[PDB]
Amino acid sequence: HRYRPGTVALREIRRYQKSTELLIRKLPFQRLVREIAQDFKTDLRFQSSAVMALQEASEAYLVALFEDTNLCAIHAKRVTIMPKDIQLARRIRGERA
Template sequence: MVRVKQINGKQKLEDTIQEKILKAKKDKYESKTSVDKSKKLYRKRGNFVLDEIRHYQLVTENLILKKPFQRLVKEILINVQAENARPLYRMSCAAVCILQDMAESYLTDLMNDGVICALHANRITIFPKDFDLVLRLSPNY
């Protein structure tokens, strides 16, 4: 049974036909533009890595998590205390944060110089020998 509009008691069949045509066109367009959620979107190789690089270039927060870094610092302090047999060392939260910032900046500078050494050798992959070369050549490290 076809639904028809009644305006002032008169049926307008042509309005409903036009509405059906518009709805069919709209459904056809939506089916083309919508993506199946079951299908995985295909991305070109390397795009994800480039997106990660762009993201981490904009991020200003620390990349190393705070708790694991604090545990590492505590472990190093315990080892130093065991060697020296001195009283307990304590570190404030601000000191650990500053130490974390400096460690991250050191590592990023070392990585950048390692990438430059790899590119100089016409390679893309970074090898341990690149870091050895960086540590040997620069007095900053």
């Protein structure tokens, strides 16, 4: 049959909140880090541990930001997060101007 929209989303929320493994596949993230670093200094080498630490910090920060975004969206009587939500959360945080 068909699951009504919004139920499988709750199932994934339950699934991913019980687990800790990283949600971004490694190699694209590593290539993105390498590209970003290249603009600061050339012919650079990275320890896999450094790259893993970068991924852990980035994913945790993104999860916290998504939590704040969901809270902001709920405050607007809304269920869907939209860019203004991220913007407001970042603004109140003080990272974005």
